[PDB]
Amino acid sequence: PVSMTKTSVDCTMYICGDSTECSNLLLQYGSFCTQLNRALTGIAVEQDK
């Protein structure tokens, strides 16, 4: 096996799909959202490499 599926996930949309109250609460958790996107992006670039 050489590569995987280059999946990416929008944490916001995954957790608080199209909800404003939910999103405003989510903002309190800080960078969790960003770091998950970043990690998966890492994975996807590795797959191409």
Partner 1 sequence: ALDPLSETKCTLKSFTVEKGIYQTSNFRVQPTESIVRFPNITNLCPFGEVFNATRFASVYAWNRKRISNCVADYSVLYNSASFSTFKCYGVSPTKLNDLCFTNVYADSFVIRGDEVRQIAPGQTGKIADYNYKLPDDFTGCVIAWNSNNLDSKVGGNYNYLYRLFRKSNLKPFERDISTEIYQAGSTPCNGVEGFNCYFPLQSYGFQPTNGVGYQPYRVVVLSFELLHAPATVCGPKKSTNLVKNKCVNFNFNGLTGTGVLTESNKKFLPFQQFGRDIADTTDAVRDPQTL
Per CB under 8 A, 18 contacts partner 1: yes
**Cβ at position 25, least distance to partner 1 in Å:** 19
Q: Binding residue for partner 1 (CB under 8 A) from 3, 4, 6, 13? A: 13
Q: Binding residue for partner 1 (CB under 8 A) from 3, 4, 6, 10? A: 10
CA distance 16 to 30: 15
CA distance 46 to 39: 11
Residue 37 contacts residue 9 (beta carbons within 8 Å): yes
Q: Which residues bind partner 1 (CB under 8 A)?
A: 8, 10, 12-13, 18, 37, 41
